[PDB]
């Protein structure tokens, strides 16, 4: 009201085996629970509840897992439900985050005609991408992802690139930025690679350490700002979010406002969680078939989840960048179960990045008003 949901229509099921992914079962030692494909009755109950209860507008985002594994027919059905049951004539936004490997002519057409905003996961040029994003047999995926982008350009699907920043990304910002430029990808989101929740940090070859992230951010900013000066505008979600915070005092990105929200993550059995990073039994709010969205929001579990994020670290209280950074995403402060949050893992990276980039960030903000 408005309502935004993050739906996993094929649960944690996926066809790849990306090395850093903790959203899909990779092996005997990294298992993730799967509820299978969302049944029609759950999808129907979910869609009608959102249309009945939202005010203003609503948004349905499909992730996972690989959501195309639910099949095109599932999304056909989704659209049919939205047409028939939107009694309030709400504006509806749909979005899909995909590995792109199963995208074909049919998918591209459908996503284009139905105005989906699509996020396509691509870590950079061939070798960088393939290093971590492998298929079930350990083989390469980059060419199949390029094929999806090609189909999206052909059918005029609106899409953003989702790129995970690993230690390797930090060593090759030039290759990554230039690759995306050459492909004319104008909307980029760079996601810090997370180690698995509550594991000791920085133990994997891909692990993004704070010194790596500092190197990544400073260099990325330079390429971006050079483009800005030359009149080539590239949207980088993190920088866009800093600009919003500078001009408006708030950001449209979760994790940049200093406190958590309820993202209404819906697993394929209809179970609901407050954040994509926290699809765990201890944060299971209830089932969307049997509770109103307000009831889910008002649960003690959701209240607790959000309130834990209100704690401000002492360093943050005296930090010059507090009103810009706000302590960052709670997931990067959450070091051990049931313990109080601590200082953001990337605190040092933010400080050093701000010292490097703030003067130019202000220049951009002044120019976009």
């Amino acid at each position: 009201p408005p309502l935004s949901l993050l739906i996993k229509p094929a649960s944690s099921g996926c066809n790849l085996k990306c090395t850093y992914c903790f959203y899909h079962s990779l092996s005997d030692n990294r298992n993730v629970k799967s509820y299978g494909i969302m049944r029609d009755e759950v999808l129907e109950s979910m869609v009608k509840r959102v249309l009945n209860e939202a005010n203003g507008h609503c948004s349905f985002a499909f992730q996972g897992g690989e959501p195309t594994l639910a099949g095109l027919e599932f999304f056909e059905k989704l659209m049919e439900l939205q047409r028939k049951h939107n009694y309030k004539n709400l504006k509806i936004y749909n979005s899909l985050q995909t590995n792109g490997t199963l995208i074909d002519e049919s998918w591209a057409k459908f996503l284009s005609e139905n105005k989906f905003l699509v996020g396509l996961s691509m870590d950079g040029p061939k070798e960088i991408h393939n290093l971590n994003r492998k298929d079930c047999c350990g083989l390469d995926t980059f060419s199949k992802v390029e094929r999806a982008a090609e189909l999206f350009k052909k059918y005029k699907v609106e899409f953003n690139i989702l790129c995970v920043v690993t230690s390797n990304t930090a060593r090759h910002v030039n290759k990554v930025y230039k690759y995306f430029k050459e492909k004319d990808f104008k909307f980029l989101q760079f996601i810090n690679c997370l180690d698995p929740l509550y594991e000791e940090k920085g133990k994997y070859n891909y692990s993004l350490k704070p010194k790596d992230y500092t190197k990544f951010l400073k260099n990325l900013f330079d390429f971006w700002y050079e483009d800005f000066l030359n009149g080539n505008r590239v949207s980088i979600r993190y920088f866009d979010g800093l600009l919003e915070t500078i001009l408006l005092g708030k950001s449209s990105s979760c994790g940049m406002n200093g406190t958590c929200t309820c993202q209404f993550v819906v697993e394929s059995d209809g179970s609901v969680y407050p954040c994509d990073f926290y699809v765990l039994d201890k944060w299971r709010l209830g089932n969307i078939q049997d509770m109103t969205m307000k009831e889910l929001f008002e649960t003690n579990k959701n209240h607790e989840f959000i309130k834990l994020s209100f704690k401000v670290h002492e360093e943050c209280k005296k930090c010059k960048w507090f009103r810009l950074c706000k302590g960052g995403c709670r997931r990067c402060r959450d070091s051990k179960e049931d313990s109080a949050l601590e200082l953001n893992y990337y605190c040092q990276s933010y400080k050093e990045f701000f010292e490097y980039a703030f003067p130019r960030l202000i220049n951009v903000a002044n120019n976009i008003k």
Binding site: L6, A61, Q97, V118, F187, G255, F277
Partner: peptide
Amino acid sequence: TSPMCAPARS
């Protein structure tokens, strides 16, 4: 706001 690992604009 919008989730971290999801497509978003502006």
